[PDB]
Amino acid sequence: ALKPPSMYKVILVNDDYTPMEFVIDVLQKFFSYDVERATQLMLAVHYQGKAICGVFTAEVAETKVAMVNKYARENEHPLLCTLEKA
């Protein structure tokens, strides 16, 4: 009847105005990626259209999505961060 709360994928959505270096930085700062992988993941975002940055408890993911989105907002770019159920 009851189930533990799902896990959430934290996604990064590509846009035409956000500078890739920013995306790379966001990936490095908020997801602990080294440049090698960070750049790749960015390439996914950029060419795939979106990319799964990590997977956490809903309780957490909601928060990462918020932080990433603010940083975006503060550094004046539309870089969209979202979450989805695993």
């Binding site: 533990p4 709360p5 809903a58 957490v60 928060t63």
Partner: protein, 142 residues
């Protein structure tokens, strides 16, 4: 304003999340630190809660899922999950509409029940507790 005890229990669980260098302090961290809070547990004991099976289940889940900071940099401090922030606020806001000047542990406990996607709540609900229950106990005793 929070009662001496609750604030202890907070500083307590916070201090623990830095010592283990946890990125975020969650509700689970809280509900847990609550387990050893006068006001909180009384209510829990009163609902016949396995104060030991909970502690485990939480400690355990706090572990498997709480991102840890990279031993590298110290230019970061335990960030309260949004859910934490909300629980804490739903409790201050209610103690405020009752006039009494101090928020109690149990006040927070009741709050947690409202963060429906937290584990802390699923746990509490798995141990057969319900908001009513906790609230009934705080209003009267039964």
């Amino acid at each position: 304003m929070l009662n001496q005890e609750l604030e202890l229990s907070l500083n307590m669980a916070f201090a623990r999340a830095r010592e283990h260098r946890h990125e975020f302090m969650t509700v689970e961290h809280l509900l847990l630190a609550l387990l050893s809070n006068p006001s909180a547990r009384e209510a829990l004991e009163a609902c016949s809660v396995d104060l030991v099976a909970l502690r485990q289940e939480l400690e355990a889940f706090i572990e498997q899922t709480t991102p840890v900071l990279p031993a590298s940099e110290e230019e970061r401090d335990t960030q309260p999950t949004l859910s934490f922030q909300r629980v804490l606020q739903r409790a201050v806001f209610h103690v405020q509409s009752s006039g009494r000047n101090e928020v109690t542990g149990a006040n927070v406990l009741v709050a947690i029940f409202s963060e429906q996607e937290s584990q802390a709540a699923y746990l509490l609900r798995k141990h057969e507790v319900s908001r009513l229950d906790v609230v009934n106990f705080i209003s009267h005793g039964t």
